[PDB]
Amino acid sequence: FQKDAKSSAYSSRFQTPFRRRREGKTDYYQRKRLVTQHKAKYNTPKYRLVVRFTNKDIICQIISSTITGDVVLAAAYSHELPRYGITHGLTNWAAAYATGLLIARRTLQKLGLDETYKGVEEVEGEYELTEAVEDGPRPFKVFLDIGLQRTTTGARVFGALKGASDGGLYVPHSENRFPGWDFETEEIDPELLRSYIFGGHVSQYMEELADDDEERFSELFKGYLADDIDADSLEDIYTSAHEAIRADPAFKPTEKKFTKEQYAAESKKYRQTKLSKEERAARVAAKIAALAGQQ
Amino acid sequence: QNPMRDLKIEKLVLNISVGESGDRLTRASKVLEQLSGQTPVQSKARYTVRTFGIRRNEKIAVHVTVRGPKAEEILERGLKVKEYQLRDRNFSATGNFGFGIDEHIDLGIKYDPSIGIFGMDFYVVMNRPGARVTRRKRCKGTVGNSHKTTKEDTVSWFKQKYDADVLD
Amino acid sequence: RRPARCYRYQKNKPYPKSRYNRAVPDSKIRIYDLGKKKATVDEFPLCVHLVSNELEQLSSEALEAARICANKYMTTVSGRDAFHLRVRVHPFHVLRINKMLSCAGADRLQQGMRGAWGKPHGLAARVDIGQIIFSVRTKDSNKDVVVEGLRRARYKFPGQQKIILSKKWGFTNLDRPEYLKKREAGEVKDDGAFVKFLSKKGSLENNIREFPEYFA
Amino acid sequence: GKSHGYRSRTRYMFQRDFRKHGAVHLSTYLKVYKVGDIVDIKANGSIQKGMPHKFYQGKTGVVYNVTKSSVGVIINKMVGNRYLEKRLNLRVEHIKHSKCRQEFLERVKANAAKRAEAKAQGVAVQLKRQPAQPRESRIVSTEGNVPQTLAPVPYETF
Amino acid sequence: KSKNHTAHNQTRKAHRNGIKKPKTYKYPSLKGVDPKFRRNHKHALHGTAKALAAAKK
RNA sequence: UCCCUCAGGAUAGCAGAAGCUCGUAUCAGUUUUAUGAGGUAAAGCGAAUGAUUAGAGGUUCCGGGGUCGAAAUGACCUUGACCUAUUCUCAAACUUUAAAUAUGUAAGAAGUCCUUGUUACUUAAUUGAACGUGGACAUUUGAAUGAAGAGCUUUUAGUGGGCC
RNA sequence: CAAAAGGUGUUAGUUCAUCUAGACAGCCGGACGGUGGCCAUGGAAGUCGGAAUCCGCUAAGGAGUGUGUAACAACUCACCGG
RNA sequence: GGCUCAUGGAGAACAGAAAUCUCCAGUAGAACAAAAGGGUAAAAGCCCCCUUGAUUUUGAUUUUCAGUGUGAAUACAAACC
RNA sequence: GGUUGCGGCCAUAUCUACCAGAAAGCACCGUUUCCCGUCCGAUCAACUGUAGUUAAGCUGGUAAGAGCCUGACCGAGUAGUGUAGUGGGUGACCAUACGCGAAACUCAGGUGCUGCAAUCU
RNA sequence: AGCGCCGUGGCGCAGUGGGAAGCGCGCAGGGCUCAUAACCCUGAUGUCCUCGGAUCGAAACCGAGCGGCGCUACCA
Incomplete structure (x- = not known):
């Protein structure tokens, strides 16, 4: 008896923002x-390295935009690193790097620029971008779409x-927002x-939390123990993952276990469908008839 | 049914409000630092009143908020001073509540003659798990009518836990 | 004030008492509803109208003078609660006056038509052709006290007006028999001033809260 | 005094639209403009850079220059007794394509298809358009349509 | 004392001998067009000139 | 348009004359077809801003007081603040909606389609972009009607109080 | 140049009401008993009003339209009728 | 780069119409140096970090318009940030 | 058909109340050594995918719902307006001729559709 | 309307370096006198006109707004 804040005048004058806002x-x-x-440049369609952190996945797509909707050049997911042998830690810094390597390698395989722009074959963990080769085509300009993720170091x-x-x-980027960018001195x-x-931060947590709370080392790393994986091996696991990704990023789908028709048949069963005009005619007639005769 | 409607104290906001910045508020900051174990935040005056004896931008009040088993322990300490007896006022329509303690030397704190005496405003922000949705950056939304912690549920919970009465 | 023939016709655009006027002499008419302005709709079935058959501006003065005249006559003959009269024309148009002044004064005002923009003189009700002035609602028994009241009121305004015994019920937009056909079933309810009719739309239980003589 | 400022008399035209406030939808930017393409001029008041004068609002010209966030349009400006060649520099939210020229450029291909087809067949093409011709001789049948004799109405109030 | 402005007879004056279109040449004004497009376009047209001067045999 | 300009001038327009380049053009104080722009007339206020008359309902927590057992965070009111659904009438400097008349642009050889050439611009690229080479489609040459010749230039008169 | 407002001047028209005695006319029989109808008061009795409102033989007559009175009474209007 | 403003609602010692604290609603009803209008809601607003594009070179363009000037503005280009 | 990531148009998509959701996915959720940001790991950051969960989100359906979007010989050829007359009228204004033609109101329907890539009993 | 001077206790005012409000008149209460006046003592009464800012310091210093006083102008 105070506000009636959601008035008919409010709802009539309310402009709804863009459906994805x-x-x-x-x-x-x-x-x-x-x-x-x-x-x-007229039609040189701007590609974006779109990266998305869900729970238990690192989605990373190379997307260019049309008037009718965004299309994908290549797409990688961290759930398909276990083919290369990253079984545990699918949504960590090390998985992100591996999916970033995989999506880059997939594109350059597709576009036929794999032979030149191989990238870095001796990882020191240095900030450096891919230089354009003289007497040859230029490297792929893609721009990192981050979304609603903060630019933290x-x-x-x-x-x-x-x-x-x-x-x-x-x-293109600067070294500002990398882990180990010492803030005091510009280095x-x-x-x-x-x-x-190489998951150094996870491995350097493993031996500290193994010697300390073993109840918490049984809470976490229950998959790491079940795999017989130890704190030392992870550097060589990720190195094997890097080389295998670089060798064969051949864009392999699943086997599709009950095909698109069989899925539709199964999914359509429980989903409630809209009533008709004669359905509502009977519904309101019944809900009137409820009150008509003193209940 | 009722799997994850656990209804846990989100935070406890301990607020002290002086009309004076300098000696007594530098003391009251050390009081809240002592109690909670966090360097508190000195609130600034919004607009001059000239009746209470404050101007704007004058650093009048100071408060802190605690989260988790600490907030539960300070709420126990504060409730036993209020006798486990809190009026059916003090409990907002949005299922939050609070109370005021006089003479901070209660709660098992020493007098601390170096600083002196102060009053506090306890406010317990009550909430059910999975209320992140309203506060997270990406894919915001409002909790359903089910998950809205209401007055009646905060009252009936305050009875069950702490072994207290509502007095009204 | 000046004569009415100075400001009879709709020559200038609607000049309302706005945030640009700011300093207007208040309307001479303040009471628009007289008689039994609290009567049930079913109490007063016959409605008659005094409609302007011409297009012009009517002074706030004329409105009050004609209202005074008509209500007086009807209150004296029938009684002060045998009808409800309603003025349906509000003085909003502001009339200006140049007011040719004798001396220049200290402020050095001006002579004839230099800065001739006028000052608010009084208000006017901009009536149109087939636009209603006075609505009345009485019994079907009267009609005669009512038309004669409205006739005595016509002598106050300029131009030409007509008296129309409408086929509507009270100040409703429904006809005499078809209003009764809604009042047959529980399709009608009363505020006290006016009536709310049942809509064939909205929340069903919310409609059935009222009109329980409908859904019966 | 009198006011003849740049955005003067433009309360209602550089007004946004009812419930079409806020952001510009991205198709506007993804649209491609090339030289010789006929484009409209209609300012988006929400965008206050490279915006056209109220004169050019409603006009149609042809793109002459193409650069970063903007085009260049040629418009015909009559002043006294003769047109001039007025070159605007407009940001790309203040313009759009003309279906005027889109419906012509598809009629050209429709004519090209009709003629190239009917060159090697039985020919009665008539490529030119003709206006609304006086309607031909038809028989109107009164089978369950026995004409209703209408009469004019008497006068009555309301 | 005078009058101030009228647009009376101004149409008649204009239309008597005038209202005329700017004649539209082929190869239009390539001035106030993107300078780096021009800088290049010169070298393109010079290239096409050399290529037809080579073709002439 | 500018001027210590307002009884005057320069300026552009309207005007005359001298012609000139060519020979029915792709021009037109016009319509049609297609596609823009508009916020005026009308309309609207149980749609926002502002104005504005009338009751009904809730008031309940709250500004005016007891009528009352001194006394009721109270049974009966006038009540102000309001909220709810209705109601009468309005807006040059309100508005969702929105004309008529006027108004932009297009309706093709400087056109379309198919190959291919340079370029220091741009492209991840052998992709484009601008301009072309070489071919192909002139009966309907891509709406109506008109066309008194169409375009071009120089120079200079008067006028710059107007009025209906 | 003429306005509002008026005319049983005259013409046409709109709606409702009356007619086998209409009814209008246009003259003349009555306008009543109960009843001194309630309260207001020296007084109000048909006519200070708040208001009620029935009957009798009834052709019809208000438990009263105007003169008249301290208050009545009376003459007279609808209302019907030779 | 983070956040959401007016106002209202329910609440916490002194503290009340108004000091500070917490939640709920909130299409802008706030704010943006001024006049008024337009514009703006993960901003153009409010809070925080770094700077000096308020820079150099001269040309084209729009409004006023004689298509002169002045003022203001636009869009590039070449440098440096 | 379901879901996700990125979208096009930007309410047929929003609002209000309720009631469902197998799979997968999304989510909520767990921890604080590290990077990192806070008065508070609440938001932001990193770790795990483990300890639990469909109650919320999210998706779908329901309502003589609000709102919005459609359509109509609905109102209405009304209001208005271009053109014309030595038409009418003291005037205000109005009728007719040739054209163009709304807004409200009423009633009927509707309640997102679609692009790419991957996944899914 | 303009021009000039102003705004602090009930009245009339001072006030300054910016840190922090006094002077006279009155007002209330004492003293003196036989008593009244004169006289001598005490006190009490403050949105320093207002909203902003410069500032660590303002009532003063800057800006804007409001109010007050006096003069000039003004003869139907």
């Missing part, structure tokens, strides 16, 4: 300044950036970055 999934202020191109979203740059893509130390590349 209502879903809270897209920064259009960013997306405009990001996708829009120099018009003197030592983010996995920049793990994927480092992965892609090492994977042979030209993703990167490649030790902590190379640690984070």
Whole structure:
């Protein structure tokens, strides 16, 4: 008896924002300044290294925009690193780097620029971008779409950036937001970055939390113990993953276990479908008839 | 049914408000630092009143918020001073509550003659697990009518835990 | 005030008492509803209208003078609660006056038509052709006290007006028999001033809270 | 005094639109403009750079220059007794394509298809358009349509 | 004392001898067009000139 | 348009004359077809801003007081603040909606389609972009009607109080 | 140049009401008993009003339209009728 | 780069209409140096970090318009940030 | 058909109340050594995918719902307006001729559709 | 309306370096006198006109707004 804040006048005059601002999934202020191109290039479709951190997955897509909707050049997911032998830690800094390497290698395989722009074959964990070769075509300009993720130093979203740059893509950046960018003096130390590349931070937690709370070492790392995996092996696991990704990123789907028709048949069963006009005619007639005769 | 509607203290906000910045508020900051174990935040005056004896930008009040088993322990300490007896006022329509303690030397704190005496405002922000949705950056949303911690549920919980009465 | 023939016709655009006027002499008419302004709709079935058959501006003065005249006559003949009269024309148009002044004064005002923009003189009700002035609602038994009241009121305004015994019920937009056909079933309810009719739309239980003589 | 400022008399036209406030939808930017392409001029008041004068609002020209965030349009400006060649520099949110020229450029291909087809067949093409011709002789049948004799109405109030 | 402005007879004056279109040449004004497009376009057209001067045999 | 300009001038327009380049053009104080732009007339206020008349309902927690057992965080009111659904009438400097008349642009050889050439611009690229080479489609040459010749230039008169 | 407002001047028209005695006319029989109808008061009795409102033989007559009175009474209007 | 403003609602010692604290609603009803209008909601607003594109070179363009000037503005290009 | 990531148009998509959701996915959720940010690991950061969960989110459905979007010979050829007359009228204004033609209101329907890539009993 | 001077206790005012409010009149209460006046003592009464800012320091210093006083102008 005070507000009636959600009035008919309010709802009539209410402008709803863009459906993906209502879903809270897209920064259009960013997306405009990001996708829009120099018009003197006409049709050179701007590619974006779109990186997304869900729970238990690192989605990383190379997307270019049409008037009708975004399309994908190549797409990688961290759930398909276990083919290369990263079974545990799918959504960590090391997985991000590996998915960044995989998505870069997939594109350059597709586009036929794998032979040149191989990337970095001796990882020191240095900040460096892929230089354009003289007497040859230029490297792939892709721009990192981050979304609603903050630009913090030592983010996995920049793990994927480092992965892609090492994977042979030209993703331009500075060393500011890398793990081990010492804040006081304007310098990167490649030790902590190379640690984070090869899961050094997870492995250096393993031996500390193994000697300390073993109840917490049974809570976490229950898969790492079940695999007989130890704290030392992880550097060589990720090195085997890097080389196997670089050898064969051949874009392998599943076997599709009950095909698209069989899935539709099964999914359509429980989903409630809309009533008709005669359905509501009977419904309201019944809900009137309830009150008609003193209940 | 009721799997994860656990209804746990989100935070406890301990607020002290002086109309004076300098000697007594540098003391009251050390009081909240002593109790909680966190360097607190000195609130600044919004607009001059000239009746209470404050101006704007004058650093009038100071408060802190605690989260988890600490907040539960300080709420125990504060409730036993209030006798486990809190009026059916003091408990907001959004299922939060609070109370005021006079003479901070209660709660098993020493007098600390170097600083002196102060009053506090306890406010317990009550909440059910999975309320991150409203506060997280990406994919925001409002909790359903089910998950909205209401007055009646905060009252009936405050009875069950702490072994207290509502007095009204 | 000046004569009415100075400001009879709708020559200038609607000049309302706005945030740009700011300093207007208040309307001479303040009471628009007289008689039994609290009567049930079913109490007063017959409605008659005094409609302007011409287009012009009517002074706030004329409105009050004609209202005074009509209500007086009807209250004296029938009684002060045998009808409800309603003025349906509000003085919003502001009339200006140049007011040619004798001396220049200390402020050095001006002579004839230099800065001739006028000052608020009084208000006017901009009536149109087939636009209603006075609505009345009485019994079907009267009609005669009512038309004669409205006739005595016509002598106050300029131009030409007509008296129309409408086929509507009270101040409703429904006809005499078809309003009764809604009042047959529980399709009608009463505020006290006016009536709310049942809509064939909205939340069903919310509609059934009222009109329980409908759904019966 | 009198006011003849750049954005003067432009309350209602550089107004946004009812419930079409806020952001520009991205198709606007993804659209490609090339030289010789006929484009409209209609400012987006939400964007206050490279915006056209209220004169050019509503006009249609042809793109002459193409650069980063902007085009260049040629418009015909009558002043006294003769047109001039007015070159605007417009950011790309203040313009759009003309379906005017889109419906012509598809009619050209429709004519090209009709003629190239009917060159090697039985020919009665008539490529030119003709206006609304006086309607031909038809028989109107009164089978369950026996004409309703309408009469004019008497006058009545309301 | 005078009057101030009227647009009376101004149409008649204009239309008597005038209202005329700017004639539209082929090869339009390539001035105030993107300078680096021009800088290149020169070298393109010079290239096409050399290529037809080579073709003439 | 500018001027210590307002009884004057320069300026552009309207005007005359001298012609000139060519020979029915792709021009037109016009319509049609297609595609823009508009916020005026009308309309609207149980749609926002502002104005504005009338009751009904809730008021309950709250500004005016007891009528009352001194006394009721109270049974009956006038009540102000309001909220709810209705109601009468309005807006040059309100508005969702929104004309008519006027108004932009297009309706093709400087066109379309298919190959291919340079370029220091741009592209991840052998992709483009601008301009072309070489071919192909002139009966309907890509709406109506008109066309008195169409375009071009120089120079200079008067006028710059107007009025209906 | 003429306005509002008026005319049983005259013409046409709109709606409702009356007619086998209409009814209008246009003259003339009555306008009543109960009843001194309640309260207001020296007084109000048909007519200070708040208001009620029935009957009798009834052709019809208000438990009263105007003169008249301290208050009645009376003459007279609807209302019907030779 | 983070956040959301007016106002209202329910609440916490002194503290009340107004000092500070917490939650709920909140299409802008706030704010943006001024006049007024337009514009703006993960911003153009409020809080925080770094700077000096308030720079150099001259040209084209729009409004006023004689298509002169002045003022203001636009879009590039070449440098340096 | 389901879900996700990125989207196009930007309410047929929003609002209000309720009621469902197998799979997978999404989520909530767990921990604080490290990078990192806080007065508070609440938000942001890193770790795990383990300890639990569909209650919330999310998706879908329901309602003579609000709102929005459609359509109509619905109102209405009304209001208005271009053109014309030595039409009418004291005037205000109005009728007719040739054209163009709304807004409200009423009633009927509707309640997102679609692009790419991957996944899914 | 303009021009000039102003705004602090009930009245009239001072006030300054910016840190922090006094002077006279009155007002209330004492003393003196036989008593009244004169006289001598005490006290009490403050949104320093307002909203902002410069500032660690303002009532003063800057800006804007409000109010007050006096003069000039003004003869139907």
